Design a protein around this ligand. Structure first.
Ligand SMILES: [Mg+2]
Ligand SMILES: [Zn+2]
Length: 724
């Protein structure tokens, strides 16, 4: 029962962005203001992309804390018979639903419910101030999402397709087969899935009618553009009728383009103004092509003061793994920290040569990638990462280039751990861990994006029998014969690997990071060159091994399914270094000070280069070979081979899993600042590092459209209620 529950004393931290914001000029602040607003508007779309009840839950809480702040509500809640412990349980839950934009954890895809009796919360909500101003709206909301807010039925606990899970990227009656069928339909029409959803309905006959709905401001009405309009029709695909519609998240996206236009007025240069014009095109029409062209302009704007990106980008939470979750961020460049990353780019092309795979599997042309350290002012969406490689359009990654980003002030929050909190470690390891995990993470994050995601060439064939590579000269180094597999027209990385695409690529990126972290030159770029360099390496690997063990929390044993892509990647890497044997990694079941079941992680420092590196190189070379040729069947057999969780000796993971769950530590919530505009001045509003502080950060997040946004999210959820 500890699962599906956010602990009262869950950690909360705020972002250090006060100083970064002060550096900006009066115009750049107006540029960052509207971009941030656009992001937060679009962030609400995640509610519709999470759970059926998430829009209702957000709207219900947004009405509560609008009338009564967390301290005003406290007096009311305690007067109704709730203990202070039970009230804090509600604040944490609300702060949870806010920081994830849904009642499911973005990192774990797990449902969480309030930690208090259902009837006690009913008394608080139905007896509140917002319930006496708009009783019709409040009581309605409570009768709609009341049971679902607390219901922990097995089918509701996790995100997923079929009867066994919950997802709003699809309808309730959808299964994996419907997703694969729809995917082939999209590849054949050359229509991207990044901003689409799939709905399978049935007529009075029982014959399933599939509907693909693109996300856009404009609806069924005709517009000027025809690149999307000429696709809005009915189809006949393998005996199954397909309909391509749009207008998804229309009122929300309408608010988004409003702020994108206003931001274009304060645009720095021409590229920033053209990319926003295309983003407006993509959100108004529903054109990923418009987004692709906008992203193309975005890569051209190198070293900007106010970096930004927005749209349906990442596909982690899509059960099939091709549909994008809406996000967007505004950040100020940290020219101080970014000095360490541009020297890495200076020798980046060099480091790509010492990678395990032959130079025929690397991008033929190496464009200089823009790598900058950023201080985040705003990151809308489900959660916040440490670093990002963008865009995810593979054709752009080998044409115009790409941008690497390390979030400076986000790493600052992560750089916080107590000695007793560190689990599955020996006492002598704890010291080196605390001392070096900070610098070691910068090492990993840098290689993860630049030389990890930023490397690798995909084999593509055009309409004619011509390839972007010489067919007669390229040899598969794992087979011996020439290449017999490639990406056809319209096929992308995600469309072919689907349900493991996200995990597979991060694992390839993670392994690259570990691999190239052994290079004394790379460490010199950050500045270590010595025994301190040796320690960073040991920590970078010990962290990886320990993460692999901790990853067992995000595995569901009954469905044989991984819920988090990055953690599945590290468990794979963990098993790769256990397959290598030679006493490199050992996991031993022990007993802690409290007497509860425990475990220990031991890693041999001297055998990292003699046993670890060659084992990782073999694994690293196989990954890229199967990615470039696009060999799914083999790619799956390899990755899902090491991603298999069984309690086979000597590790016995299923038994260790309970130990991990028993002693697990929830990740901390993050409070983000706000920007307010009075006359011509742009001020920065900061908040408390608390649950109540986080709630206040959202109550003042929409000053104008408070009541209106709650109205939009409500009716948008009401229309599609039939699907679930
Ligand atoms: Mg389902
Ligand atoms: Zn990554």
């Amino acid at each position: 029962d500890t699962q599906y529950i956010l602990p009262n004393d869950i950690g909360v931290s705020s972002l250090d962005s006060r100083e970064a914001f002060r550096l900006l000029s009066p115009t750049e602040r107006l540029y960052a203001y509207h971009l941030s607003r656009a992001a937060w508007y679009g962030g609400l779309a995640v509610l519709l992309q999470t759970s059926p009840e998430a829009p209702y839950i957000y709207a219900l809480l947004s009405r509560l804390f609008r009338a009564q702040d967390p301290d005003q509500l406290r007096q009311h809640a305690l007067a109704e018979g709730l203990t202070e412990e039970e009230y804090q349980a509600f604040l944490v839950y609300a702060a949870g639903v806010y920081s994830n934009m849904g009642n499911y954890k973005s990192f774990g895809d797990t449902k969480f419910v309030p930690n208090l009796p259902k009837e006690k919360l009913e008394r608080v909500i139905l007896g509140s101030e917002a319930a006496q101003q708009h009783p019709e709206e409040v009581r309605g909301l409570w009768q709609t999402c009341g049971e679902l807010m607390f219901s922990l039925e097995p089918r509701l606990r996790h995100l997923g397709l079929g009867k066994e899970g919950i997802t709003t990227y699809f309808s309730g009656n959808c299964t994996m087969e419907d997703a694969k069928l729809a995917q082939d339909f999209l590849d054949s029409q050359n229509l991207s899935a990044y901003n689409t959803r799939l709905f399978k309905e049935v007529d009075g006959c029982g014959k399933p009618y599939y509907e693909v709905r693109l996300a856009s401001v404009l609806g069924s009405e005709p517009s000027l553009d025809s690149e999307v309009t000429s696709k809005l029709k009915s189809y006949e695909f393998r005996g199954s009728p397909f309909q391509v519609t749009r207008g998804d998240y229309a009122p929300i996206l309408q608010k988004v383009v409003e702020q994108l236009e206003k931001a274009k007025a304060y645009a720095a240069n021409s590229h920033q103004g053209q990319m926003l014009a295309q983003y407006i095109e993509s959100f108004t029409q529903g054109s990923i092509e418009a987004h692709k062209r906008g992203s193309r302009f975005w890569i051209q704007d190198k070293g900007p003061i106010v970096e930004s990106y927005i749209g349906f980008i990442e596909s982690y939470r899509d059960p099939f793994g091709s549909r994008g979750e809406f996000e967007g961020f505004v950040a100020v460049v940290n020219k101080a920290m970014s000095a360490k990353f541009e020297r890495l780019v200076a020798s980046a092309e060099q480091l790509l040569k010492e990678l395990p795979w032959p130079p025929t599997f690397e991008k033929d042309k190496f464009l200089t990638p823009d790598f900058t350290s950023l201080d985040v002012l705003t990151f809308a969406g489900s959660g916040i990462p440490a670093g990002i490689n963008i865009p995810n359009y593979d054709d752009l990654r080998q044409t115009e280039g790409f941008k690497n980003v390390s979030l400076g002030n986000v790493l600052a929050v992560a750089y916080a751990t107590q000695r007793e909190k560190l689990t599955f470690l020996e006492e002598d390891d704890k010291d080196l861990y605390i001392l070096w995990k900070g610098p070691s993470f910068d090492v990993q994050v840098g290689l993860h994006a630049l030389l990890g995601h930023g490397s690798g060439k995909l084999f593509v064939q055009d309409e004619k029998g011509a390839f972007n590579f010489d067919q007669e000269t390229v040899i598969n180094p794992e087979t011996g014969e020439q290449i017999q597999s490639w990406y056809r027209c319209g096929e992308t990385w995600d469309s072919k690997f689907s349900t493991i695409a996200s995990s597979y690529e991060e694992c390839r990126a993670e392994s690259v990071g570990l691999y190239l972290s052994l290079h004394p030159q790379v460490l010199e770029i950050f500045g270590f060159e010595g025994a301190d360099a040796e320690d960073v390496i040991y920590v970078n690997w010990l962290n990886m091994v320990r993460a692999g063990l901790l990853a067992l929390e995000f595995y569901t044993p009954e469905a044989f399914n991984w819920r988090q892509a990055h953690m599945q990647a590290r468990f794979v890497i963990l098993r790769v270094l256990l397959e290598a044997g030679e006493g490199l990694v050992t996991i031993t079941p022990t007993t802690g000070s409290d007497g509860r079941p425990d475990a220990r992680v031991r890693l041999d420092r001297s055998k990292i280069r003699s046993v670890g590196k060659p084992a990782l190189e073999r694994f690293l070379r196989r990954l890229q070979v199967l990615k470039s040729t696009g060999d799914v069947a083999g790619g799956r057999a390899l990755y899902e081979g090491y991603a298999t969780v069984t309690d086979a000796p000597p590790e016995s993971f299923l038994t260790l899993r309970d130990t991990v769950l028993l002693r697990k530590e929830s990740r901390k919530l993050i409070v983000q600042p706000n920007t307010r505009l009075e006359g011509s001045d742009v001020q920065l509003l900061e908040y408390e590092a608390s649950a109540a502080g986080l709630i206040r950060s959202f109550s003042e997040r929409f000053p104008e459209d408070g009541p209106e946004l709650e109205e939009i999210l409500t009716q948008l959820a009401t229309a599609d209620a039939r699907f679930w």
